[PDB]
Design a protein around this nucleic acid. Structure first.
Ligand code: ADP
Ligand code: ALF
Ligand code: K
Ligand code: K
Ligand code: K
Ligand code: K
Ligand code: K
Ligand code: K
Ligand code: K
Ligand code: MG
Length: 438
DNA sequence: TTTTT
C-alpha cells in the first residue's frame, strides 16, 4: 500500500539494529504507519517477544496493540512498585509476558506519565532479574510531545523527564515530511504554527474562515471532536434525538461479588455502556476485537433490530446470565479498507473485572457498541479523519487544539467552531525539550 | 477538564 520514505526506512533500520530509541515528528508524519512496519519486521525475528502498546485504547487499536497499562498488569499502577510487582506476579499471564518481551513499543508517548514510566522501568528490572535499562527490553517510543500531555487530576511529569527515559532512550530521530495534509501546504503551515503556541494573525484568521458548514454526501457523516465528555455525550444525544424511529433502549446486566460502593465505582469505568440507546441509522463504534477485519474502534451503521434466532467451562457459566432480551442490532461496519462494508448481527458480550485466579469480581453484559458520532479530542489523538467538525469551546489543555485541528486530511473537510488563540498553548517543558534537540 | 483496569 504505502512505500516508506527514506526517513521512515532509516528509523526502521535503527529499530531493527536493537537500539532503544524515541522517534518523533509532527502530526501525520507517518509515525504509526512506520510503526506497523516495525512490528511486522520485528516479529519475523521475535515472534512472541514484541509488545505493542499505546497510551490510549484507541491509539493502541490503530497499531494492533493494547494499552500500556493493560500490558503491564498494573491495573492503574497507582501504589508503590513493591506492591505492583506482587500483583503482576499473581497474574501469571502478565508475569510470563514481562519475561518473554524483547521489544516494548509505546505509541503516543506524549500521554505517558514519567512516573508511570519509572515504575515500568523498575518492574522490568525486577521481574526479569536484569539490571539493564528496562531489564534488557528494547524500548521504542513513538509520538509527539507537542500533542496532549499526560492526564493529571509541576504535577505534569513528561516522559522525557523520567530517569527511565534518560537511561534507556539512546537516540532520537525526527520525521519531517507531513503526509496527512500533504496536498495543502498552507494548511501544513497553519498546523505547524500551533505547535509552540504562538499563532500568527493570518493562521488564526484562516482557521476562523473554516467555521463554514461542511457539505457532504447523503451518507457521509462528519466526525465531531470536543474537549469534554459532556459535549461528546450531548452531541451523540442530539444526533440520536433528531432521528425518528422510537429509540431502542438496551440496559446492561450488571452483576458482581464486590461490595458497594466498590462495585458501582468499578462499573462506572467500563467502556461498555450501562444504557445503550440505538435508533435506525445511528452512528456506532464496535468496542471489541471480534474478527481480524472487525476490531475494536471500527465504525458502523445500524440498519435494523430483530433476531428471534431466525434471521438466517466459564462460557456456559455466563450464558445463563444472557437473558437474550429479544432483539439484536443489525450493524454494517466499514472495514479497515476505506470503501467496503460488512453487515453483521451484533451479539451481547461480557466484560469482567477479575482476580488473577479467574474469579470474576464484577460482570457487565452489553452489546459491544457505543454511539460513535462524536469523540473526545484525547481519544482522537492518532486518528486520521477525512471529514471532521472541531468545536474548540471547552479546550482546556496544552496541545489539545493542535491535536484536534491536525486530525483533518484537508481544510475542505474540516469545520472549526469557536476558534481562539487563547485555546492554543504548549507546555514550557515541551518547547525546551525540542529546542535542546540540536 | 481529559486518560489509564
Ligand atoms: N510513507 C507514506 N506515504 C504516503 N502516505 C503516508 C505515509 N506514511 C503515512 N502516510 C499517511 O499519513 C496519514 C497519517 O499517518 P500516521 O501514521 O497516522 O502519522 P502519525 O502517526 O505521525 O500521525 C495516514 O493516513 C497514512 O496513510
Ligand atoms: F502524530 Al498522529 F495521528 F499519531 F498525528
Ligand atoms: K538473568
Ligand atoms: K499546495
Ligand atoms: K502575526
Ligand atoms: K484561507
Ligand atoms: K443482554
Ligand atoms: K470543546
Ligand atoms: K489552554
Ligand atoms: Mg500516530
Amino acid at each position: 500500500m504505502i512505500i516508506l520514505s527514506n526517513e521512515q526506512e532509516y528509523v526502521l533500520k535503527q529499530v531493527l539494529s536493537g537500539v532503544s530509541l524515541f522517534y518523533t515528528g509532527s502530526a501525520g508524519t507517518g509515525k504509526s504507519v512506520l510503526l506497523r512496519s516495525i512490528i511486522k519486521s520485528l516479529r519475523d525475528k521475535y515472534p512472541k517477544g514484541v509488545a505493542v502498546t499505546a497510551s490510549t485504547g484507541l491509539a493502541a487499536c490503530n497499531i494492533g496493540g493494547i494499552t500500556l497499562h493493560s500490558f503491564a498488569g498494573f491495573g492503574l499502577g497507582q501504589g508503590k512498585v513493591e506492591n505492583l510487582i506482587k500483583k503482576i506476579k499473581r497474574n501469571k499471564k502478565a508475569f510470563t509476558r514481562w519475561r518473554e518481551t524483547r521489544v516494548l513499543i509505546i505509541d503516543e508517548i506524549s500521554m505517558v506519565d514519567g512516573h508511570l514510566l519509572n515504575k515500568l522501568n523498575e518492574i522490568a528490572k525486577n521481574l526479569r532479574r536484569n539490571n539493564r535499562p528496562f531489564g534488557g527490553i528494547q524500548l521504542v517510543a513513538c509520538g509527539d510531545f507537542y500533542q496532549l500531555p499526560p492526564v493529571v487530576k509541576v504535577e505534569v511529569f513528561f516522559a522525557f523527564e523520567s530517569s527511565a527515559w534518560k537511561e534507556t532512550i539512546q537516540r532520537t530521530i525526527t520525521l519531517k515530511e507531513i503526509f496527512r495534509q500533504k496536498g495543502d501546504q498552507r494548511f501544513i503551515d497553519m498546523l505547524n504554527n500551533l505547535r509552540d503556541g504562538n499563532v500568527p494573525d493570518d493562521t488564526a484568521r484562516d482557521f476562523c474562515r473554516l467555521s463554514r458548514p461542511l457539505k457532504c454526501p447523503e451518507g457521509i457523516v462528519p466526525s465531531e471532536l470536543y474537549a469534554t465528555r459532556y459535549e461528546v455525550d450531548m452531541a451523540n444525544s442530539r444526533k440520536l434525538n433528531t432521528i425518528q424511529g422510537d429509540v431502542v433502549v438496551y440496559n446492561s446486566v450488571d452483576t458482581g461479588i464486590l461490595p458497594e460502593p466498590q462495585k458501582t465505582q468499578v462499573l462506572t469505568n467500563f467502556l461498555a455502556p450501562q444504557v445503550l440507546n440505538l435508533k435506525v441509522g445511528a452512528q456506532v463504534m464496535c468496542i471489541k476485537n471480534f474478527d481480524d477485519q472487525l476490531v475494536n474502534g471500527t465504525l458502523g451503521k445500524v440498519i435494523d433490530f430483530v433476531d428471534r434466532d431466525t434471521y438466517m467451562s466459564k462460557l456456559k457459566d455466563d450464558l445463563m446470565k444472557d437473558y437474550k432480551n429479544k432483539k439484536y442490532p443489525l450493524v454494517k461496519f466499514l472495514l479497515p479498507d476505506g470503501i467496503t462494508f460488512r453487515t453483521v448481527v451484533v451479539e451481547p458480550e461480557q466484560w469482567t473485572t477479575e482476580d488473577e485466579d479467574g474469579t470474576v469480581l464484577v460482570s457487565r453484559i452489553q452489546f459491544p457498541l457505543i454511539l460513535a458520532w462524536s469523540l473526545s479530542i484525547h481519544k482522537s489523538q492518532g486518528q486520521t479523519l477525512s471529514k471532521v467538525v472541531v468545536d474548540m469551546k471547552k479546550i482546556f489543555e496544552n496541545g489539545q487544539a493542535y491535536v484536534a485541528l491536525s486530525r483533518a486530511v484537508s481544510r475542505a473537510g474540516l469545520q472549526v467552531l469557536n476558534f481562539n488563540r487563547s485555546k492554543v498553548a504548549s507546555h514550557r517543558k515541551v518547547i525546551e525539550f525540542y529546542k535542546n534537540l540540536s
